[model samples]
Target: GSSGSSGMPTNCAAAGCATTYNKHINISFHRFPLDPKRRKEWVRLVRRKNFVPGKHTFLCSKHFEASCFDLTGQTRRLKMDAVPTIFDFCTHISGPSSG
Candidate 1:
């Protein structure tokens, strides 16, 4: 058995998202804030129930609002109030007729 693991690549932490460093190049990944208070808010925004953030856990730029980023410089930085608000939770299992 080849029991060995390669260095893990960064991936988007959002549910239903498959964004990865190797798959996506033009995307930026944001780290979980060190501040417990702020970090908790981010967790809530991401809508991950009972989720724990590890050192490598990161959310991609796709989740954040454009206004939350500071694009003034070459590197976009998250504002103090930055929180991931975008998530793909599309479910049309049963379409209820509205018309």
Candidate 2:
């Protein structure tokens, strides 16, 4: 294992995504909301298993639609009611009962 005191990278929580904070200046990173109800909605929509996000865990702006953001005067901010709706994994990962 390679180790040099490099801490965790701030990456998107979505599966099949490689979006990292350092690489994407155009993309904005958002931490999981403090509200438990809103937090659960994000986790469900992300569709990852056994994922319990910490304060540092982030979801990128790309996962959300344009309407989800206010983008007020170059400030990349999300609406309070925003939920991630864009996903790219449903075609590949399907359960036996889903068909």
Candidate 3:
């Protein structure tokens, strides 16, 4: 017989709070493999001009919180007040459309 598990444990630190999205996104990002060898090689090949490691930490905190609390569905609302980028719009649009 084989054993299986469904659903992973979640901290749910900010339950019913405006920061839930931020927490969820952070969990997803951190779950990525951070192998130096793999990432270093890809980074070199990509030669990302605007890469900034620490910047992610700051932006994630600021924007993710705002996104979770954003009352208006307008992409512009999220853009100006939060990340202010097309990527956020694209993500929000595509996620719901696919479902």
Against the true structure, whose TM-score is highest? Answer: 2
Tens digit per residue, CA lDDT, model 2, 21-82: 46325666677776777688888878887588875577877788867777765755787668
TM-score of each: 0.67, 0.69, 0.19
lDDT of 1 by residue, 1-99 (tens): 034356357766777887775643566667887777768877776667978888667887777876788886655787656777766554345554353
Kindly report which residue stretches of model 1 are placed more than 4 angstroms away from their true locations once superposed.
Answer: 1-8, 22-24, 91-99
**Residue pairs whose backbone atoms clash in candidate 2:** none
Top candidate by lDDT? 2
**Across residues 1-99, which tens digit of lDDT does each residue of candidate 3 receive?**
024344344322211223324323533212111455533432332234434333232122332445533356542222322321222324353456465
Ranking by lDDT: 2, 1, 3
Cα lDDT listed for each candidate: 0.70, 0.71, 0.31
Residue runs of model 3 more than 4 Å from their true location after superposition: 1-32, 50-99
Candidate with better TM-score, 2 vs 3: 2
Q: Rank the candidates by TM-score, best first.
A: 2, 1, 3
